[PDB]
Amino acid sequence: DAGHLSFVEEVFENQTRLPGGQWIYMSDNYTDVNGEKVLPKDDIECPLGWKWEDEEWSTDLNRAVDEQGWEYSITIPPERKPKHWVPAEKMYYTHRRRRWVRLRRRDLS
């Protein structure tokens, strides 16, 4: 009854392609919201003292994503990376990502 802290981990699965081409995996390929590498979701461990509450990672289709959980972008060059993501695939989009989440908890007592 001391309660627990909760935290939802969030990581992004990234893919790219050439216009009109097939999607493939980035070098990093898992990152956070802004582009920094993290490990593949399935290899991600809780910090010391925490445990997973959700049995599985999940991807939330109520967000602005397509029916498989992807949002899409393109780099608009003055910029160095994608900045604005959208739910619909268009043939000239070169980047896409899928947001995966999983709840963990830490008991206070």
PDB file of N, CA and C in Angstrom:
ATOM      1  N   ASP A   1       0.804  -1.222   0.000  1.00  0.00           N
ATOM      2  CA  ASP A   1       0.000   0.000   0.000  1.00  0.00           C
ATOM      3  C   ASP A   1       0.848   1.289   0.000  1.00  0.00           C
ATOM      4  N   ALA A   2       2.173   1.167  -0.094  1.00  0.00           N
ATOM      5  CA  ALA A   2       2.992   2.368  -0.275  1.00  0.00           C
ATOM      6  C   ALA A   2       2.740   2.922  -1.688  1.00  0.00           C
ATOM      7  N   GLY A   3       2.157   2.088  -2.558  1.00  0.00           N
ATOM      8  CA  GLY A   3       1.949   2.463  -3.966  1.00  0.00           C
ATOM      9  C   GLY A   3       3.157   2.170  -4.818  1.00  0.00           C
ATOM     10  N   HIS A   4       3.096   2.573  -6.097  1.00  0.00           N
ATOM     11  CA  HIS A   4       4.196   2.332  -6.986  1.00  0.00           C
ATOM     12  C   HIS A   4       4.299   3.503  -7.931  1.00  0.00           C
ATOM     13  N   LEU A   5       5.505   3.655  -8.433  1.00  0.00           N
ATOM     14  CA  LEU A   5       5.760   4.575  -9.532  1.00  0.00           C
ATOM     15  C   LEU A   5       5.486   3.832 -10.823  1.00  0.00           C
ATOM     16  N   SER A   6       4.988   4.555 -11.822  1.00  0.00           N
ATOM     17  CA  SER A   6       4.817   3.978 -13.136  1.00  0.00           C
ATOM     18  C   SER A   6       5.520   4.809 -14.199  1.00  0.00           C
ATOM     19  N   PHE A   7       5.980   4.110 -15.227  1.00  0.00           N
ATOM     20  CA  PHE A   7       6.629   4.738 -16.359  1.00  0.00           C
ATOM     21  C   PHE A   7       6.408   3.932 -17.660  1.00  0.00           C
ATOM     22  N   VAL A   8       5.979   4.638 -18.722  1.00  0.00           N
ATOM     23  CA  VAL A   8       5.832   4.022 -20.020  1.00  0.00           C
ATOM     24  C   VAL A   8       7.063   4.315 -20.868  1.00  0.00           C
ATOM     25  N   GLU A   9       7.749   3.269 -21.246  1.00  0.00           N
ATOM     26  CA  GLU A   9       8.948   3.381 -22.096  1.00  0.00           C
ATOM     27  C   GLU A   9       8.425   3.585 -23.489  1.00  0.00           C
ATOM     28  N   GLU A  10       9.143   4.350 -24.310  1.00  0.00           N
ATOM     29  CA  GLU A  10       8.720   4.671 -25.658  1.00  0.00           C
ATOM     30  C   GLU A  10       9.938   4.558 -26.562  1.00  0.00           C
ATOM     31  N   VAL A  11       9.868   3.749 -27.608  1.00  0.00           N
ATOM     32  CA  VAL A  11      11.025   3.646 -28.539  1.00  0.00           C
ATOM     33  C   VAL A  11      10.423   3.550 -29.921  1.00  0.00           C
ATOM     34  N   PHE A  12      11.185   3.928 -30.942  1.00  0.00           N
ATOM     35  CA  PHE A  12      10.716   3.999 -32.288  1.00  0.00           C
ATOM     36  C   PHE A  12      11.481   3.039 -33.167  1.00  0.00           C
ATOM     37  N   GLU A  13      10.750   2.242 -33.929  1.00  0.00           N
ATOM     38  CA  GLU A  13      11.287   1.338 -34.960  1.00  0.00           C
ATOM     39  C   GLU A  13      11.338   2.143 -36.227  1.00  0.00           C
ATOM     40  N   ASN A  14      12.523   2.324 -36.810  1.00  0.00           N
ATOM     41  CA  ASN A  14      12.694   3.114 -38.033  1.00  0.00           C
ATOM     42  C   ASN A  14      13.001   2.326 -39.310  1.00  0.00           C
ATOM     43  N   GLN A  15      12.415   2.768 -40.424  1.00  0.00           N
ATOM     44  CA  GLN A  15      12.735   2.243 -41.737  1.00  0.00           C
ATOM     45  C   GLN A  15      12.878   3.372 -42.747  1.00  0.00           C
ATOM     46  N   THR A  16      13.589   3.080 -43.829  1.00  0.00           N
ATOM     47  CA  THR A  16      13.729   3.999 -44.970  1.00  0.00           C
ATOM     48  C   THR A  16      13.629   3.310 -46.337  1.00  0.00           C
ATOM     49  N   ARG A  17      13.515   4.119 -47.386  1.00  0.00           N
ATOM     50  CA  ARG A  17      13.473   3.596 -48.738  1.00  0.00           C
ATOM     51  C   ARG A  17      13.830   4.688 -49.711  1.00  0.00           C
ATOM     52  N   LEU A  18      13.917   4.313 -50.977  1.00  0.00           N
ATOM     53  CA  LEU A  18      14.000   5.280 -52.046  1.00  0.00           C
ATOM     54  C   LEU A  18      12.589   5.497 -52.539  1.00  0.00           C
ATOM     55  N   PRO A  19      12.301   6.685 -53.068  1.00  0.00           N
ATOM     56  CA  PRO A  19      10.959   6.959 -53.586  1.00  0.00           C
ATOM     57  C   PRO A  19      10.425   5.816 -54.450  1.00  0.00           C
ATOM     58  N   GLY A  20       9.236   5.330 -54.084  1.00  0.00           N
ATOM     59  CA  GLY A  20       8.568   4.274 -54.817  1.00  0.00           C
ATOM     60  C   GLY A  20       9.160   2.905 -54.558  1.00  0.00           C
ATOM     61  N   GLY A  21      10.127   2.831 -53.641  1.00  0.00           N
ATOM     62  CA  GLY A  21      10.868   1.599 -53.392  1.00  0.00           C
ATOM     63  C   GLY A  21      10.348   0.816 -52.196  1.00  0.00           C
ATOM     64  N   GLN A  22      11.080  -0.219 -51.792  1.00  0.00           N
ATOM     65  CA  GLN A  22      10.665  -1.035 -50.657  1.00  0.00           C
ATOM     66  C   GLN A  22      11.310  -0.537 -49.367  1.00  0.00           C
ATOM     67  N   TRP A  23      10.616  -0.710 -48.259  1.00  0.00           N
ATOM     68  CA  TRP A  23      11.134  -0.252 -46.988  1.00  0.00           C
ATOM     69  C   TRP A  23      12.247  -1.192 -46.473  1.00  0.00           C
ATOM     70  N   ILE A  24      13.257  -0.644 -45.788  1.00  0.00           N
ATOM     71  CA  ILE A  24      14.332  -1.433 -45.172  1.00  0.00           C
ATOM     72  C   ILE A  24      14.813  -0.857 -43.843  1.00  0.00           C
ATOM     73  N   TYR A  25      15.601  -1.614 -43.081  1.00  0.00           N
ATOM     74  CA  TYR A  25      16.016  -1.155 -41.738  1.00  0.00           C
ATOM     75  C   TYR A  25      17.253  -0.247 -41.562  1.00  0.00           C
ATOM     76  N   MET A  26      17.049   0.879 -40.854  1.00  0.00           N
ATOM     77  CA  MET A  26      18.156   1.776 -40.463  1.00  0.00           C
ATOM     78  C   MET A  26      19.322   1.039 -39.724  1.00  0.00           C
ATOM     79  N   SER A  27      20.490   1.676 -39.629  1.00  0.00           N
ATOM     80  CA  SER A  27      21.613   1.096 -38.878  1.00  0.00           C
ATOM     81  C   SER A  27      21.249   0.999 -37.405  1.00  0.00           C
ATOM     82  N   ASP A  28      20.945   2.148 -36.812  1.00  0.00           N
ATOM     83  CA  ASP A  28      20.347   2.187 -35.488  1.00  0.00           C
ATOM     84  C   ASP A  28      19.094   1.345 -35.523  1.00  0.00           C
ATOM     85  N   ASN A  29      18.057   1.938 -36.090  1.00  0.00           N
ATOM     86  CA  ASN A  29      16.818   1.247 -36.391  1.00  0.00           C
ATOM     87  C   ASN A  29      15.873   1.249 -35.226  1.00  0.00           C
ATOM     88  N   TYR A  30      16.386   1.349 -34.001  1.00  0.00           N
ATOM     89  CA  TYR A  30      15.540   1.753 -32.872  1.00  0.00           C
ATOM     90  C   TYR A  30      16.100   3.031 -32.266  1.00  0.00           C
ATOM     91  N   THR A  31      15.208   3.973 -31.982  1.00  0.00           N
ATOM     92  CA  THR A  31      15.605   5.262 -31.421  1.00  0.00           C
ATOM     93  C   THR A  31      14.553   5.787 -30.452  1.00  0.00           C
ATOM     94  N   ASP A  32      14.798   6.982 -29.900  1.00  0.00           N
ATOM     95  CA  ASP A  32      13.718   7.737 -29.272  1.00  0.00           C
ATOM     96  C   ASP A  32      13.103   8.779 -30.247  1.00  0.00           C
ATOM     97  N   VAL A  33      12.161   9.553 -29.698  1.00  0.00           N
ATOM     98  CA  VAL A  33      11.319  10.499 -30.445  1.00  0.00           C
ATOM     99  C   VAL A  33      12.095  11.469 -31.389  1.00  0.00           C
ATOM    100  N   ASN A  34      13.333  11.820 -31.023  1.00  0.00           N
ATOM    101  CA  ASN A  34      14.132  12.802 -31.779  1.00  0.00           C
ATOM    102  C   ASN A  34      15.242  12.231 -32.670  1.00  0.00           C
ATOM    103  N   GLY A  35      15.530  10.932 -32.552  1.00  0.00           N
ATOM    104  CA  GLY A  35      16.512  10.287 -33.422  1.00  0.00           C
ATOM    105  C   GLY A  35      17.730   9.615 -32.784  1.00  0.00           C
ATOM    106  N   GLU A  36      17.782   9.484 -31.456  1.00  0.00           N
ATOM    107  CA  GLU A  36      18.976   8.931 -30.810  1.00  0.00           C
ATOM    108  C   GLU A  36      18.832   7.449 -30.621  1.00  0.00           C
ATOM    109  N   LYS A  37      19.893   6.720 -30.943  1.00  0.00           N
ATOM    110  CA  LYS A  37      19.867   5.257 -30.887  1.00  0.00           C
ATOM    111  C   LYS A  37      19.533   4.717 -29.497  1.00  0.00           C
ATOM    112  N   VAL A  38      18.764   3.622 -29.484  1.00  0.00           N
ATOM    113  CA  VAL A  38      18.519   2.791 -28.308  1.00  0.00           C
ATOM    114  C   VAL A  38      18.581   1.345 -28.765  1.00  0.00           C
ATOM    115  N   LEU A  39      18.425   0.381 -27.870  1.00  0.00           N
ATOM    116  CA  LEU A  39      18.429  -1.012 -28.314  1.00  0.00           C
ATOM    117  C   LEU A  39      17.080  -1.423 -28.878  1.00  0.00           C
ATOM    118  N   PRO A  40      17.065  -2.449 -29.740  1.00  0.00           N
ATOM    119  CA  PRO A  40      15.818  -3.120 -30.125  1.00  0.00           C
ATOM    120  C   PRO A  40      14.925  -3.326 -28.914  1.00  0.00           C
ATOM    121  N   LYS A  41      13.630  -3.082 -29.087  1.00  0.00           N
ATOM    122  CA  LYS A  41      12.700  -3.130 -27.983  1.00  0.00           C
ATOM    123  C   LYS A  41      12.826  -4.423 -27.196  1.00  0.00           C
ATOM    124  N   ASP A  42      12.974  -5.533 -27.906  1.00  0.00           N
ATOM    125  CA  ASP A  42      12.895  -6.812 -27.219  1.00  0.00           C
ATOM    126  C   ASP A  42      14.120  -7.059 -26.356  1.00  0.00           C
ATOM    127  N   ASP A  43      15.171  -6.281 -26.563  1.00  0.00           N
ATOM    128  CA  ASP A  43      16.359  -6.409 -25.761  1.00  0.00           C
ATOM    129  C   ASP A  43      16.406  -5.400 -24.623  1.00  0.00           C
ATOM    130  N   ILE A  44      15.382  -4.570 -24.512  1.00  0.00           N
ATOM    131  CA  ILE A  44      15.434  -3.468 -23.559  1.00  0.00           C
ATOM    132  C   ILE A  44      15.101  -4.017 -22.180  1.00  0.00           C
ATOM    133  N   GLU A  45      15.958  -3.740 -21.193  1.00  0.00           N
ATOM    134  CA  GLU A  45      15.717  -4.174 -19.811  1.00  0.00           C
ATOM    135  C   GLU A  45      15.161  -3.060 -18.927  1.00  0.00           C
ATOM    136  N   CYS A  46      14.421  -3.400 -17.869  1.00  0.00           N
ATOM    137  CA  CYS A  46      14.073  -2.408 -16.860  1.00  0.00           C
ATOM    138  C   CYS A  46      15.315  -1.924 -16.138  1.00  0.00           C
ATOM    139  N   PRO A  47      15.302  -0.672 -15.655  1.00  0.00           N
ATOM    140  CA  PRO A  47      16.361  -0.267 -14.740  1.00  0.00           C
ATOM    141  C   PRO A  47      16.275  -1.080 -13.447  1.00  0.00           C
ATOM    142  N   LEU A  48      17.388  -1.106 -12.730  1.00  0.00           N
ATOM    143  CA  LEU A  48      17.464  -1.795 -11.476  1.00  0.00           C
ATOM    144  C   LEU A  48      16.316  -1.371 -10.563  1.00  0.00           C
ATOM    145  N   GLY A  49      15.578  -2.337 -10.018  1.00  0.00           N
ATOM    146  CA  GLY A  49      14.549  -1.990  -9.059  1.00  0.00           C
ATOM    147  C   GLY A  49      13.183  -1.898  -9.694  1.00  0.00           C
ATOM    148  N   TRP A  50      13.124  -1.867 -11.018  1.00  0.00           N
ATOM    149  CA  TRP A  50      11.840  -1.774 -11.729  1.00  0.00           C
ATOM    150  C   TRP A  50      11.491  -3.108 -12.297  1.00  0.00           C
ATOM    151  N   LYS A  51      10.201  -3.323 -12.594  1.00  0.00           N
ATOM    152  CA  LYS A  51       9.765  -4.463 -13.347  1.00  0.00           C
ATOM    153  C   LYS A  51       8.723  -4.103 -14.393  1.00  0.00           C
ATOM    154  N   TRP A  52       8.633  -4.935 -15.427  1.00  0.00           N
ATOM    155  CA  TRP A  52       7.605  -4.695 -16.469  1.00  0.00           C
ATOM    156  C   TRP A  52       6.213  -5.030 -15.919  1.00  0.00           C
ATOM    157  N   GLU A  53       5.241  -4.181 -16.199  1.00  0.00           N
ATOM    158  CA  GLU A  53       3.829  -4.463 -15.917  1.00  0.00           C
ATOM    159  C   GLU A  53       3.151  -5.012 -17.170  1.00  0.00           C
ATOM    160  N   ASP A  54       3.360  -4.391 -18.325  1.00  0.00           N
ATOM    161  CA  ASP A  54       2.776  -4.904 -19.566  1.00  0.00           C
ATOM    162  C   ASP A  54       3.560  -6.184 -19.925  1.00  0.00           C
ATOM    163  N   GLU A  55       2.896  -7.267 -20.300  1.00  0.00           N
ATOM    164  CA  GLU A  55       3.586  -8.459 -20.788  1.00  0.00           C
ATOM    165  C   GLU A  55       4.336  -8.275 -22.120  1.00  0.00           C
ATOM    166  N   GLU A  56       3.930  -7.295 -22.921  1.00  0.00           N
ATOM    167  CA  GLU A  56       4.388  -7.145 -24.310  1.00  0.00           C
ATOM    168  C   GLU A  56       4.513  -5.678 -24.639  1.00  0.00           C
ATOM    169  N   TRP A  57       5.319  -5.353 -25.665  1.00  0.00           N
ATOM    170  CA  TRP A  57       5.295  -4.023 -26.228  1.00  0.00           C
ATOM    171  C   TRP A  57       4.055  -3.891 -27.079  1.00  0.00           C
ATOM    172  N   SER A  58       3.541  -2.684 -27.177  1.00  0.00           N
ATOM    173  CA  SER A  58       2.320  -2.434 -27.967  1.00  0.00           C
ATOM    174  C   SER A  58       2.506  -1.151 -28.775  1.00  0.00           C
ATOM    175  N   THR A  59       1.684  -0.980 -29.800  1.00  0.00           N
ATOM    176  CA  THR A  59       1.777   0.215 -30.627  1.00  0.00           C
ATOM    177  C   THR A  59       0.355   0.737 -30.810  1.00  0.00           C
ATOM    178  N   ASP A  60       0.169   2.020 -30.526  1.00  0.00           N
ATOM    179  CA  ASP A  60      -1.148   2.627 -30.347  1.00  0.00           C
ATOM    180  C   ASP A  60      -1.667   3.216 -31.626  1.00  0.00           C
ATOM    181  N   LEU A  61      -2.668   2.556 -32.223  1.00  0.00           N
ATOM    182  CA  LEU A  61      -3.216   2.976 -33.495  1.00  0.00           C
ATOM    183  C   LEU A  61      -4.242   4.127 -33.373  1.00  0.00           C
ATOM    184  N   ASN A  62      -4.578   4.602 -32.160  1.00  0.00           N
ATOM    185  CA  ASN A  62      -5.395   5.826 -32.058  1.00  0.00           C
ATOM    186  C   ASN A  62      -4.605   7.100 -32.365  1.00  0.00           C
ATOM    187  N   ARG A  63      -3.285   6.979 -32.345  1.00  0.00           N
ATOM    188  CA  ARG A  63      -2.434   8.096 -32.734  1.00  0.00           C
ATOM    189  C   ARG A  63      -2.484   8.300 -34.241  1.00  0.00           C
ATOM    190  N   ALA A  64      -1.812   9.348 -34.726  1.00  0.00           N
ATOM    191  CA  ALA A  64      -1.868   9.661 -36.156  1.00  0.00           C
ATOM    192  C   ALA A  64      -0.916   8.806 -36.958  1.00  0.00           C
ATOM    193  N   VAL A  65      -1.300   7.538 -37.096  1.00  0.00           N
ATOM    194  CA  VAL A  65      -0.491   6.562 -37.777  1.00  0.00           C
ATOM    195  C   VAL A  65      -1.395   5.733 -38.709  1.00  0.00           C
ATOM    196  N   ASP A  66      -0.765   4.966 -39.588  1.00  0.00           N
ATOM    197  CA  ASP A  66      -1.477   4.069 -40.501  1.00  0.00           C
ATOM    198  C   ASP A  66      -1.900   2.767 -39.829  1.00  0.00           C
ATOM    199  N   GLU A  67      -2.566   1.874 -40.580  1.00  0.00           N
ATOM    200  CA  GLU A  67      -3.207   0.702 -39.971  1.00  0.00           C
ATOM    201  C   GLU A  67      -2.185  -0.329 -39.429  1.00  0.00           C
ATOM    202  N   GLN A  68      -0.923  -0.187 -39.786  1.00  0.00           N
ATOM    203  CA  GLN A  68       0.144  -1.026 -39.230  1.00  0.00           C
ATOM    204  C   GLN A  68       0.979  -0.280 -38.189  1.00  0.00           C
ATOM    205  N   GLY A  69       0.573   0.938 -37.842  1.00  0.00           N
ATOM    206  CA  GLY A  69       1.256   1.685 -36.789  1.00  0.00           C
ATOM    207  C   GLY A  69       2.369   2.646 -37.267  1.00  0.00           C
ATOM    208  N   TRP A  70       2.528   2.834 -38.576  1.00  0.00           N
ATOM    209  CA  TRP A  70       3.573   3.726 -39.112  1.00  0.00           C
ATOM    210  C   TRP A  70       3.144   5.181 -39.342  1.00  0.00           C
ATOM    211  N   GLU A  71       4.072   6.113 -39.072  1.00  0.00           N
ATOM    212  CA  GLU A  71       3.949   7.510 -39.538  1.00  0.00           C
ATOM    213  C   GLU A  71       5.153   7.715 -40.470  1.00  0.00           C
ATOM    214  N   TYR A  72       5.039   8.686 -41.380  1.00  0.00           N
ATOM    215  CA  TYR A  72       5.912   8.826 -42.539  1.00  0.00           C
ATOM    216  C   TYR A  72       6.477  10.225 -42.586  1.00  0.00           C
ATOM    217  N   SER A  73       7.673  10.353 -43.164  1.00  0.00           N
ATOM    218  CA  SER A  73       8.234  11.667 -43.371  1.00  0.00           C
ATOM    219  C   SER A  73       9.196  11.691 -44.528  1.00  0.00           C
ATOM    220  N   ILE A  74       9.809  12.848 -44.717  1.00  0.00           N
ATOM    221  CA  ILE A  74      10.808  13.029 -45.737  1.00  0.00           C
ATOM    222  C   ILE A  74      11.772  14.107 -45.170  1.00  0.00           C
ATOM    223  N   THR A  75      13.033  14.139 -45.573  1.00  0.00           N
ATOM    224  CA  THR A  75      13.869  15.247 -45.139  1.00  0.00           C
ATOM    225  C   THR A  75      13.693  16.383 -46.133  1.00  0.00           C
ATOM    226  N   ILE A  76      13.409  17.575 -45.609  1.00  0.00           N
ATOM    227  CA  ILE A  76      13.151  18.758 -46.422  1.00  0.00           C
ATOM    228  C   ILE A  76      14.417  19.608 -46.352  1.00  0.00           C
ATOM    229  N   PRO A  77      15.210  19.636 -47.431  1.00  0.00           N
ATOM    230  CA  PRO A  77      16.577  20.087 -47.194  1.00  0.00           C
ATOM    231  C   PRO A  77      16.791  21.581 -47.108  1.00  0.00           C
ATOM    232  N   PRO A  78      16.326  22.217 -46.022  1.00  0.00           N
ATOM    233  CA  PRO A  78      17.512  22.811 -45.400  1.00  0.00           C
ATOM    234  C   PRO A  78      17.873  21.871 -44.244  1.00  0.00           C
ATOM    235  N   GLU A  79      16.872  21.109 -43.795  1.00  0.00           N
ATOM    236  CA  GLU A  79      16.952  20.304 -42.588  1.00  0.00           C
ATOM    237  C   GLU A  79      17.744  19.033 -42.798  1.00  0.00           C
ATOM    238  N   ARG A  80      18.159  18.425 -41.690  1.00  0.00           N
ATOM    239  CA  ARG A  80      19.149  17.348 -41.715  1.00  0.00           C
ATOM    240  C   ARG A  80      18.479  16.013 -41.516  1.00  0.00           C
ATOM    241  N   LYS A  81      17.274  16.057 -40.965  1.00  0.00           N
ATOM    242  CA  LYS A  81      16.520  14.855 -40.704  1.00  0.00           C
ATOM    243  C   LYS A  81      15.035  15.155 -40.812  1.00  0.00           C
ATOM    244  N   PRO A  82      14.201  14.112 -40.796  1.00  0.00           N
ATOM    245  CA  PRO A  82      12.768  14.363 -40.785  1.00  0.00           C
ATOM    246  C   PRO A  82      12.368  15.081 -39.504  1.00  0.00           C
ATOM    247  N   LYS A  83      11.349  15.922 -39.633  1.00  0.00           N
ATOM    248  CA  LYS A  83      10.918  16.820 -38.566  1.00  0.00           C
ATOM    249  C   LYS A  83       9.416  16.691 -38.351  1.00  0.00           C
ATOM    250  N   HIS A  84       8.666  16.551 -39.441  1.00  0.00           N
ATOM    251  CA  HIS A  84       7.203  16.471 -39.350  1.00  0.00           C
ATOM    252  C   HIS A  84       6.727  15.163 -39.911  1.00  0.00           C
ATOM    253  N   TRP A  85       5.943  14.430 -39.129  1.00  0.00           N
ATOM    254  CA  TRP A  85       5.532  13.072 -39.495  1.00  0.00           C
ATOM    255  C   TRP A  85       4.014  13.093 -39.772  1.00  0.00           C
ATOM    256  N   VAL A  86       3.556  12.180 -40.612  1.00  0.00           N
ATOM    257  CA  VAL A  86       2.177  12.161 -41.041  1.00  0.00           C
ATOM    258  C   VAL A  86       1.687  10.724 -41.174  1.00  0.00           C
ATOM    259  N   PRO A  87       0.360  10.548 -41.126  1.00  0.00           N
ATOM    260  CA  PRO A  87      -0.171   9.186 -41.055  1.00  0.00           C
ATOM    261  C   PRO A  87      -0.256   8.415 -42.373  1.00  0.00           C
ATOM    262  N   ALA A  88      -0.318   9.111 -43.496  1.00  0.00           N
ATOM    263  CA  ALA A  88      -0.572   8.494 -44.791  1.00  0.00           C
ATOM    264  C   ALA A  88       0.726   8.288 -45.555  1.00  0.00           C
ATOM    265  N   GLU A  89       0.902   7.126 -46.177  1.00  0.00           N
ATOM    266  CA  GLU A  89       2.065   6.883 -47.023  1.00  0.00           C
ATOM    267  C   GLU A  89       1.830   7.563 -48.354  1.00  0.00           C
ATOM    268  N   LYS A  90       2.873   8.204 -48.878  1.00  0.00           N
ATOM    269  CA  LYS A  90       2.842   8.762 -50.221  1.00  0.00           C
ATOM    270  C   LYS A  90       4.106   8.216 -50.822  1.00  0.00           C
ATOM    271  N   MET A  91       4.123   8.102 -52.125  1.00  0.00           N
ATOM    272  CA  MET A  91       5.204   7.387 -52.779  1.00  0.00           C
ATOM    273  C   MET A  91       6.571   8.057 -52.630  1.00  0.00           C
ATOM    274  N   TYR A  92       6.575   9.388 -52.506  1.00  0.00           N
ATOM    275  CA  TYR A  92       7.849  10.092 -52.314  1.00  0.00           C
ATOM    276  C   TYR A  92       8.321  10.186 -50.876  1.00  0.00           C
ATOM    277  N   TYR A  93       7.593   9.629 -49.908  1.00  0.00           N
ATOM    278  CA  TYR A  93       8.086   9.644 -48.518  1.00  0.00           C
ATOM    279  C   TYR A  93       9.234   8.619 -48.373  1.00  0.00           C
ATOM    280  N   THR A  94      10.295   9.002 -47.655  1.00  0.00           N
ATOM    281  CA  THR A  94      11.523   8.205 -47.577  1.00  0.00           C
ATOM    282  C   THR A  94      11.801   7.608 -46.214  1.00  0.00           C
ATOM    283  N   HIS A  95      11.019   8.007 -45.224  1.00  0.00           N
ATOM    284  CA  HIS A  95      11.224   7.585 -43.838  1.00  0.00           C
ATOM    285  C   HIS A  95       9.905   7.165 -43.221  1.00  0.00           C
ATOM    286  N   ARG A  96       9.948   6.169 -42.365  1.00  0.00           N
ATOM    287  CA  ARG A  96       8.779   5.902 -41.555  1.00  0.00           C
ATOM    288  C   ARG A  96       9.232   5.332 -40.213  1.00  0.00           C
ATOM    289  N   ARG A  97       8.364   5.465 -39.217  1.00  0.00           N
ATOM    290  CA  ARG A  97       8.674   4.950 -37.893  1.00  0.00           C
ATOM    291  C   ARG A  97       7.405   4.490 -37.183  1.00  0.00           C
ATOM    292  N   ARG A  98       7.594   3.586 -36.233  1.00  0.00           N
ATOM    293  CA  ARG A  98       6.487   2.990 -35.494  1.00  0.00           C
ATOM    294  C   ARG A  98       6.826   3.117 -34.006  1.00  0.00           C
ATOM    295  N   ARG A  99       5.935   3.736 -33.259  1.00  0.00           N
ATOM    296  CA  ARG A  99       6.186   3.964 -31.841  1.00  0.00           C
ATOM    297  C   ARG A  99       5.726   2.803 -31.001  1.00  0.00           C
ATOM    298  N   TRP A 100       6.646   2.235 -30.233  1.00  0.00           N
ATOM    299  CA  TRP A 100       6.321   1.122 -29.376  1.00  0.00           C
ATOM    300  C   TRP A 100       6.417   1.580 -27.910  1.00  0.00           C
ATOM    301  N   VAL A 101       5.478   1.129 -27.106  1.00  0.00           N
ATOM    302  CA  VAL A 101       5.427   1.480 -25.695  1.00  0.00           C
ATOM    303  C   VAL A 101       5.285   0.242 -24.795  1.00  0.00           C
ATOM    304  N   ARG A 102       5.756   0.370 -23.554  1.00  0.00           N
ATOM    305  CA  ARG A 102       5.592  -0.703 -22.546  1.00  0.00           C
ATOM    306  C   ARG A 102       5.692  -0.099 -21.143  1.00  0.00           C
ATOM    307  N   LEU A 103       4.702  -0.379 -20.326  1.00  0.00           N
ATOM    308  CA  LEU A 103       4.633   0.124 -18.939  1.00  0.00           C
ATOM    309  C   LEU A 103       5.482  -0.719 -17.995  1.00  0.00           C
ATOM    310  N   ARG A 104       6.232  -0.021 -17.131  1.00  0.00           N
ATOM    311  CA  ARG A 104       7.007  -0.618 -16.052  1.00  0.00           C
ATOM    312  C   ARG A 104       6.605   0.076 -14.773  1.00  0.00           C
ATOM    313  N   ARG A 105       6.952  -0.559 -13.650  1.00  0.00           N
ATOM    314  CA  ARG A 105       6.602  -0.054 -12.355  1.00  0.00           C
ATOM    315  C   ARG A 105       7.741  -0.278 -11.386  1.00  0.00           C
ATOM    316  N   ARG A 106       7.764   0.537 -10.335  1.00  0.00           N
ATOM    317  CA  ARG A 106       8.675   0.351  -9.205  1.00  0.00           C
ATOM    318  C   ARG A 106       7.887   0.524  -7.934  1.00  0.00           C
ATOM    319  N   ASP A 107       7.893  -0.514  -7.115  1.00  0.00           N
ATOM    320  CA  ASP A 107       7.159  -0.400  -5.860  1.00  0.00           C
ATOM    321  C   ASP A 107       7.933   0.453  -4.881  1.00  0.00           C
ATOM    322  N   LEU A 108       7.237   1.364  -4.202  1.00  0.00           N
ATOM    323  CA  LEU A 108       7.838   2.114  -3.112  1.00  0.00           C
ATOM    324  C   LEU A 108       7.948   1.283  -1.847  1.00  0.00           C
ATOM    325  N   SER A 109       6.942   0.435  -1.655  1.00  0.00           N
ATOM    326  CA  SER A 109       6.924  -0.658  -0.671  1.00  0.00           C
ATOM    327  C   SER A 109       5.550  -1.358  -0.832  1.00  0.00           C
TER     328      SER A 109
END
